Amino acid sequence: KTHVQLSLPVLQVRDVLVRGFGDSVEEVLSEARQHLKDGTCGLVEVEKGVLPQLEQPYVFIKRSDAAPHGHVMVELVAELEGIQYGRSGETLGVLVPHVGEIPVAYRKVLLRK
Numbered sequence: 001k002t003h004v005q006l007s008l009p010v011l012q013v014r015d016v017l018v019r020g021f022g023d024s025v026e027e028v029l030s031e032a033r034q035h036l037k038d039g040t041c042g043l044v045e046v047e048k049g050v051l052p053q054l055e056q057p058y059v060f061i062k063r064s065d066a067a068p069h070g071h072v073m074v075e076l077v078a079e080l081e082g083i084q085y086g087r088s089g090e091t092l093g094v095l096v097p098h099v100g101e102i103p104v105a106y107r108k109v110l111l112r113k
């Protein structure tokens with residue numbers, strides 16, 4: 001399948017224990033994809049002051065289409081020092097490792113793998 005239905009635990013930024021996927025654009029997108037597959041990926045909603053509390057490179061899920069079965073279609077875009085690798089629609093938030101933090105919600109997405 002080119003696309004996978006996922007339910008992502010939405011985390012408060014101050015609860016996040018592991019605040020990034022790694023050290024290069026290529027590593028963060030790789031690790032993001034692995035954690036998404038393994039169901040160990042969380043989502044932090046982007047607001048004023050959220051991003052500076054997280055580690056670069058950032059991995060965003062962005063809306064790729066304008067919602068099969070409730071699941072918003074998204075794709076992965078990385079950002080390092082103001083440069084994005086990928087081009088997509090609006091940010092649904094920033095992906096982070098999930099290591100058992102209690103979420104505040106769940107975000108249903110159809111991910112282009």
Ligand SMILES: [C]C1=C(Br)[C]=C([B]([O])=O)S1
Binds near residue numbers: 036037112
């Ligand atoms: C992002 C990816 C998800 Br979810 C599942 C993959 B697979 O085919 O093993 S790759």
